[model samples]
Target: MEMEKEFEQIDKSGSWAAIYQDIRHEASDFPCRVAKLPKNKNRNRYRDVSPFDHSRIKLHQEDNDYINASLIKMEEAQRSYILTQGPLPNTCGHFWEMVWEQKSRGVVMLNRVMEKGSLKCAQYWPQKEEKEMIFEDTNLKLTLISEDIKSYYTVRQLELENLTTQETREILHFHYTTWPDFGVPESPASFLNFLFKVRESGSLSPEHGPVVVHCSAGIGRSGTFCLADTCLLLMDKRKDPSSVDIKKVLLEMRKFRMGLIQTADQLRFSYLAVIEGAKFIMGDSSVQDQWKELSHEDL
Candidate 1:
């Protein structure tokens, strides 16, 4: 297929260094401004966490929405995603506020609570034993209903209540526990299964709010997952499966969030994951079996 052919071409591009350099060079034109604004500076977890000026998502339909988050709209794929940073200790309430106001049904997490001997993200969710955790800053309540644990990932059933309005919504928490920091997963099958698992929940659908996806910085691994998912969805939506251009898709997604696929290896892994997912989307029944085997469970 065209994907396999391009995969071979990418393999022959000398090494990942060349591909990464080209991607970084292409990303030079991205209009990443306003992240350094004096007012919005404190909203970012890291100094580099900033949404693109054009596509940044404003909170509660505000006129000056300057959160470190972007609304990624894929018109052809008929999907929308909120790409944002992992919640900081202070911004955790703002994180849930965005979720509550946006009416999101799922949060796809690609990083662990802590990774690579550093604290990557805050414990934003309520603990099971704690029963209910309230975010005083956001006027929200998070109640953990149930949790499904697996070898590579964990699924959580969370109840988010707006303390002010007393409205509640059930949210799905799809946390991939095994993805290493600044690295890719062992195989695309496991990642594809996780993607499919999220899709099955109907959270990624247009009927609901945009599905929120995040990592530590909300770019690299987060970008790879969104890229692969969007490409596969576009391939399935269009008439020709092989017509999905991976580079074009990534560049388009970058228009919303900056520095997607941080490293060359991550970009390569995105290609691999998308190609493997395309096979499954193309009606390869055995790919389902392979996905299960890859995760070492019925993920």
Candidate 2:
């Protein structure tokens, strides 16, 4: 009932503004010394958005180890996520290197390469025609094996090879192409369908390393996705689903990275997705069917 009550409260006029203000005031402002270094300035996509020094993922290189990426761990929910900005043309090798070093099994991309006539993210992966891409700087190779395209999302299988060692691994790429810039999806059903699709892959499981999640800046939409997923998992684990505090969970997440769930609308959507997802996890078998029908994934 707490979830529903908060959902309705946000629906009321002016309530969202106040709540969002409070959340912004309470957000953490930890130091990010590495992101500001002159040598590492070009690695960041945005000037203000940078990973905290405490939770940032470090590369194995000796000369430079800075990347605009953070490791967010939710021990209670048994989940860990590497939230990062979209790969820059020069940092693509570093991005793949992070994936290789972390032993990540999946990359969850919530933004497109271009949006609203601007280049939001570089085309980091190899296209179907190109088949394979070799990152000479990092000595890693990415080969496209298969692709499953849908209306709102696309799933691809990639072969990641460490050219130096000749070792290889399989990686799942879940790309949600329809999520707008600083906006939520059209419906929670479609978003939940995509979330469940990622869950079904076992990529987010604890047995593997953290799954890399990103949008343009890596905090707004990335935070929304991780917040919803972590809350639902906690709700399923606890005896009472309503006991989970959405605000507290978000604040805890922000300690690792800043400015997650940017807008009030994105916060509202997190609740919507979690509430709808709870129905499915609570043993309402038919709810999934409803979500599937409502999601319109095929079209």
Candidate 3:
């Protein structure tokens, strides 16, 4: 898996009881935290809630820029790119802090591609993710996160850990979601067979805030999730947001947050996202074509 360097020292919390879970609840439920969607949008295997900036990354019309106009000297952010300045390690480290202050929210989904028969979420999270991470029920964040995703859901996180070697090993195994293949549809058939590309570098990402995301950059997965979020809002509005999609809001992701997936292989993971969980984005299909078969003009 792609991970980053470790934080050398640590401090145990005691002031208020590990309120990480409370923070998580607030982060996950809020909408429009900044003028953008906050969270590690593309720090890992998929895209997230942040908007795109086209000026920095001049890929094509399809290219999305994650930085917001409000930030100055954004020349470092690559075009059709989604990321903050400096190294990836520093970027993720920054994300860790921003997540707590209510400057951002994390929307997560568990990748369910590696299952046998129907999944029993209760049995899975406690045994696998929670167990692997050496999770404690009183750990707080896990408590709230567990309650939110509930049964039939996969695992995803928007927090940071400055742990030991053993803890790092265990915590490293935890994933926000399994990256999906590009060309598949957001449905049941393809997700169950999925696998995520190894991303060991994510161990270091900005501590918090918005990270722009979309299909090629975890956005598809984020989309499936954010789309679900929009649906809920639409349900409240008695209006369908299908036409007025989250993509419309994706542009502002950079104003308050940064760090997105910059690789094609890492970014394109929507095919299996829709299939593995309780939520679903109805119409889009994953990309099926191989890169080797494409021409220079196509890329």
Ranking by TM-score: 2, 1, 3
Q: For candidate 2, lDDT tens digit of each residue in 99-176? A: 999999999999999999999999999887376899999999999999999999999999999998899999999999
- lDDT by residue (254-299, candidate 3, tens digit) is 2323322222222122212322221222322343222112211122
Per-prediction TM-score: 0.94, 0.98, 0.29
Model 1: how far residue 282 lies from native, Å = 1.3
- The worst-scoring run of ten residues by lDDT in candidate 3 lies at 1-10
Pick the winner on lDDT between candidates 1 and 2: 2
Q: Assess the local accuracy of residue 80 in candidate 3 as a C-alpha lDDT between 0 and 100.
A: 21
Query: What does the lDDT come to for candidate 2?
Result: 0.93
Candidate 3 Cα errors over 4 Å, as ranges: 1-87, 103-176, 183-218, 239-299
Model 3 local distance difference test score: 0.27
Question: In candidate 1, what are the lDDT values of residues 240-274, reduced to their tens digit?
Answer: 98999888888888777888888888888888888
On TM-score, who's better, 2 or 3? 2
RMSD of each: 1.9, 1.0, 20.5
Pitting candidate 1 against candidate 3, the one with the higher TM-score is: 1
Best by lDDT: 2
